[PDB]
Each structure stands twice: as structure tokens, then as C-alpha cells.
Amino acid sequence: STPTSQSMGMQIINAEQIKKMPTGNGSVTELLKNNPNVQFSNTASSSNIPGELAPENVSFHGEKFYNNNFMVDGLSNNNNINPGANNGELNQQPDGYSPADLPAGGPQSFWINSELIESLEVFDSNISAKYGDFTGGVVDAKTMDPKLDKSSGKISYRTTRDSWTKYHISEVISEEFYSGTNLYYQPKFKKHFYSATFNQPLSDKAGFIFAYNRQQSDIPYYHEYLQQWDDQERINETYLLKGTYLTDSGDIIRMTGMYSPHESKFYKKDVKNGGFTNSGGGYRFNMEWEHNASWGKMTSLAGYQYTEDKTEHEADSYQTWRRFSSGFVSNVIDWSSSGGANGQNSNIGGYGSFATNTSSFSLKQDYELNPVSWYGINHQIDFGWETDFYTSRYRRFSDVYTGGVLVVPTGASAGSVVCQSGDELCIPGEQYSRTRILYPERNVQVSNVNYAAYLQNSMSYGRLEVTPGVRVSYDDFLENLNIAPRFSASYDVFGDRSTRLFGGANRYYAGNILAYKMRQGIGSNIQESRISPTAPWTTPTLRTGTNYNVSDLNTPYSDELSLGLSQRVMSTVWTAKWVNRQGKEQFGRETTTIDGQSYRVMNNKGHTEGNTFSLEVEPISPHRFSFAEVNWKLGASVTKNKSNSIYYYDSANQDEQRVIFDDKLMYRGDIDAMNFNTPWRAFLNVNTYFPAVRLSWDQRVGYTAGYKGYTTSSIQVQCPGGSSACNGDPSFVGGATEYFPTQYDDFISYDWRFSYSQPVYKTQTLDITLDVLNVLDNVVETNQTGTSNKPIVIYKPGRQFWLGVAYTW
């Protein structure tokens, strides 16, 4: 029932469109590659990493990728704690690799698959006052719902593998890649994508759906000095149990359980017993009550959500031993974690278990009053409220002792090492730790309430629809009262839907980033020392490490302006919209002094202009022929995005640095956005169904502006006597970092996806499915790294086959 002016600002992708579009894993974000206002993070598709199951990071209209409202069934699917870690780049020491890491499951708590979703509502603009806690878009993943009559269901298996995935990889990383010695170089992998679904009446007005998904990847990893092969394993399970009782009153009570635990078994390079699992996601249970009174509709909701981004290492202490060195060699330590010729250190163990968890109880109530007429205008008064009572908690579960500095008595002194009988930091007759670093059991806790309320009029007269709304909201984290005007108009110009304009002016406010609260003492470690392996641990010496703190902050916001036209040219709807976002008060990092101690502190010093012109052409109805039905959607956009070099909430304000860019001297906040910001796209989905064969051949051909990779100078250009760029400021005596461009060619993306259904008997079908991503196998550049001395280019995947089978009744 969404109104005209807002419907041109949303894209609705139902189960049929999801079955049809060419698909990789089919994360909720991969489905967004048919929205012309979505930019993916440069690395999110990459030949280096075809084993990854995680959501591809998405910017809507140049806003921060962690500032979208990802939703599942109309409830938040967002990480309020650490959503944007490492700018969404695949950091080689995953979060958890070190004892002071605040874990990060990306911006989404639950990683739902395309299998589990019955509609995706992708709101890029003109977004209703119903939706908030974003500066970005909204992606409302309506998961599969009970059917009261069908008794139906599905089982599927989908798979891809290294031998089915052509790799385009740069020569400067090829031997490291094919060695398998790096967590995010994946030359060998297997993916298995299991699912089940049952959709059954308990009684004729009381359906339930049970659904299971199991995205799995196995990925061999090689420790080059420990000389071991270990599988990394990536798993996203999702269990969903949705029930719906349609009462005799016509009011629907819906019970919605979910458990979406995703895990990633990483390892620490050459560390013995060195494995760790970044677990994440968690569970839900909601009750929703859709009441359908004489006034209209009242969708009441209560629900619990739990999220637990957790690292668990395979040990809860960490030791550095020494195999050999000048004047010493050992018989106990039987591995190496280094390659040196004069001496070698050998590492064992890990940093125990630590987690950051949200426990959020949500109340909501959405009202949709029937159209009431006043002063000749019809008013559809939508209104509502929600309250998230939440506790966020980062917490280590056991004291992690770590092995500090090792003393290794040489020659005739070696026999002096006699350990205390319980000691983890001594080896008898070999060596002992002189210092021990305790990362203690800790609990940082923040209990908060976020209130929000809205009114959303949607009101019509004389061919207009005008949809004024507001969305007041208050988080007791920052204590900000945010008032968020939303305006979205439309006019059917020529008496009919064939020619109709629209536009809007909306302020969007984002959710909390609790990372600086959860870190308030992360890296607090107590050092202790001992003179001999029999002596006591003498002197607890706390270092609080890199401290973090909360500060008085405005909420990050995005001022949208939008305008557009929808036109019915000769059997096709052409919808064109411009959208401009002034992302403002966006978070960055600062250092400040409190009670004489230095703290890292969040600031509002970031901003992002993002600008799009987007075009969306589709037919009025599918074409039909003797052979086929053929259906298509030509999306396109031209885009321009900007940033301070405050890339995310941990980035410092490098805005004031001098750089040489576009062949002139300028401040670093005047660079074009390095991530996101491919200039343009033009994608044609065409879908074909051959009734003579039951074969569907669904294909996406998409031309896009080639990546413009920038590499830094290793030495800063002394402006005075260093570059013609210096004419940009002849007063500058200092040095500038130069950026050198490489403009890779504008490229044809081409993905196929076939699916043939075979009736097993009258009620049931077995479907064979075959994606072929990059059917051309073309080399496409997608990121570029480092200085001009080490230009590591990264590419989008080669030809990748995904076979699938789906039995259904």
C-alpha cells in the first residue's frame, strides 16, 4: 500500500525475481546489483576470496555502508557495535586475531540467503518515516511466510568450487596466492549451499513455515613455517520458524523465530594450536499482531533479538618459545613460526574467547488509517512508534595469559630452568617467560533505550499525492532528540499514470555506533614479571593500551533531495530520478585528553556528498512468442561521491593533508572517493522462460565505468621544487603525498543463470539450476593497493559455475 512518490524510491524484488537473477552466494546485498543507486565496496567481489560467505558491503547514494538499515521481516538486522570495521576491507589479521580486537560481523547481524527471502524491499530514496536508523538506504528482507492451503516445501543443494571458478590474479601476489599461505587468498575452496523448507497448516487458519539454510565454504590454508594444511571453514546456518494464526476477527497473530549463526574458522599464521572462530549472528523471537479494525490497520509487535559477534581461539593462553638462537637449541619445541637462519621463534595458542553481544527487546506499533477526507484532500494517515530496549556487552570469558619476553639460558647455564608444576610459561630444562601479559576477564556493558515515533501523511487531490511525514527519535546513548522531516510528492501530469513526476526532501538519521563505548578499556592488560621460573609473578603493572571513550556527539545525518519522472513510452515504463545526499555529521576518530589520560574519541568531522542520476526502464508486460516469454529491466546510473578521508568511524581527519591529485596540489578531503564511486553503470536483466523445455535462461549484461585505481608515492613530493601540482598553492614549503591514476577500461559484466524444472509426479518438481557468473571470463580490475613501488591490483572473479538442485512439493 506504499504511496506513489515513495514507490519510485523503492525496488521490490520478490521470490520469482530472486529465482531468476544470476547469483553468487545470494546474500541480501548481492540482490542489490540490480538497483542503480547501490555501489558495492571495491573488494566485495574479488578473485582472491571466492570462499567468503559474508554480505557484500553496500553504499546507497554515496552514504556509509554501515549506515544503511538492513532489516529482516521489518526488524533491525544491524550491528550497533563495530559494523564498519577496517572500512569493510578484508584485513589480514581478522578481528579477533589479537586479544584487544572488538569483534565485527560486518554491518549485518544475520546473513540471510536468497533462499530464505520472499521479498526484498530496497528503499534507496523517498524513504517513509516508518523507516529510520540509517543514512543510506533500507533493505527490508521479508523472509518466507506461511501458506494456509498448499502444504508445500523445498529441499536444495547448490555448489561451486575452485575447479569451477576461474581466477584472475595479479603476478605480484600470484605465488603467495597459490601457496595458500594467506587467509584471504583462496586458490582452493568448495562451497555447499544446503536448504530445506516445510510450509504446513497446523489447522486450516494456522500455518507454519520451517526453513533451514546452510551456506558452507571449505578453504585450505597452509602454514609455511609450521608446515601444516588446515581447512578454514565458513558456515552460515539459518533456522527460521514462522507461524501465523488468522483469528476469526480477521486479525493475524504471527510468531517468528530465527537462529542465524554464522561462523568463520580462521587461523593465526604459523601459530601451533592457533585456530580461531569468529562466530556471529544470533537469534530472534517476535510476536506480531495485525489488527484490521474499522479505522484501518494496527500492526503491533514485540520481539527479542540477540546478536553475538564472538572470537573463540583454540586456546586461552599464548606463548612465544624459541627453537634455536646464538648459544641455544631446543628438543621440546617442535615447530617454527619464523624462517630466520640465525634463530627462530615458535608461537603456540591464542587469546581465549571474547564477544560483543546485543540483547535487544523491541516493541513496535505501526498504524495505517484508512483514507479520511478533509478540506477535499484525502489523507492516508500512517503513524507509529517503536522502542528498542537494549544491552550491548563486550566481554572476555577467561583470563588470557600471554608469554611476554622469553629468557633462554645459553650453554652451561641452560640446566637452570626448573618450572613450577602448573606453569604454562616455562619449559623444563629449556626456557621461561620473564614477563607475562594478562588480558583479564572483563565486562563492558551499556544498557540503552532508543525511542522512535512517526507520522506519515499521504494525501491526495487534483492528481497530486503529497506524503509529508516526520520521524522523531531519541537514543539515550548520545541523548540526541532527532527530528527527521520526510517530504515526498508526485503528480500524474497528463491526466493518467503514463506521465507523472515525483520528488522529495528527506532527512535521515542513523543508528548508534557503540564501538567507542565497548572499547572503553579494551586493551587493558596487566603485565607481571619474574626473576627465575620458580619465583612469584611479582608486580602487576597495568597498561590501559590505546584507550577509547564516548563524547558529546550530533547524530550522523543525510539530507536527501530527489526529483524524478516516470513515462510510459510505447509499451515500456521509463523511470528516471536524480538523488543528492548531503551526508553530514558522519563519524570519525580524534585523540583527546581526559583526567590527564589520552583517549581515542569519536567526532562528527565526516561528510559525504553523494549524487546520482538513475534510469530504470522496464516493459508494461512480458513479451510472448511461439518459443518463449521474455522479460527485462534496463537499469542505469551516473554518479559522483565525496569524502574527508574520514573513510569510517575509526578514520582520522586527514582532510587537511596536502596531496597531489588530478595533477594539482590540494587538501586530502578534496580527493574523489576512492572506495565505491565507479562513475556509471548500465545493466540489462533479461529473463527467458521456454515453456516447450521448462528451461529458464536468465541473464544479466552490464556495462560499467572501469575502475580508476589510485596508487600513492612512496616518498612525499617536496612541493617546493617537486611538482607542477605546486601551482595549486605556491606558499606550500612542505611535502605532499602524490596519487597516480590508472583508468582501467569500461567493462561488460555478463552473468547467466539457467534453471530447468522436471515434474517428478503431478504434485512435485526437481529443478536443476546453473549460474555462470562472468561467462566471458573477462579480466576486470576492482581495487588497486599500495605505493607506485608495489601496485597490487585485484580483479573481479573469472567464469564461475554454481550448479544447484531443488526438489519441491
TrEMBL record:
Transmembrane segments: none annotated. Disulfide bonds join 419-426, 719-726. Keywords: Cell outer membrane, Membrane. Its main location: membrane. Residues 7-138 form the TonB-dependent receptor plug domain. The keyword Ion transport does not apply. Gene3D superfamilies: TonB-dependent receptor, beta-barrel domain, TonB-dependent receptor, plug domain. It is found in: Cell outer membrane. The keyword Membrane applies. It comes from Pectobacterium atrosepticum (strain SCRI 1043 / ATCC BAA-672). This is TonB-dependent receptor plug domain-containing protein. GO terms for cellular component: cell outer membrane. Coiled coil: none annotated. Residues 77-91 have a biased composition (Low complexity). Residues 77-104 are annotated as: Disordered.
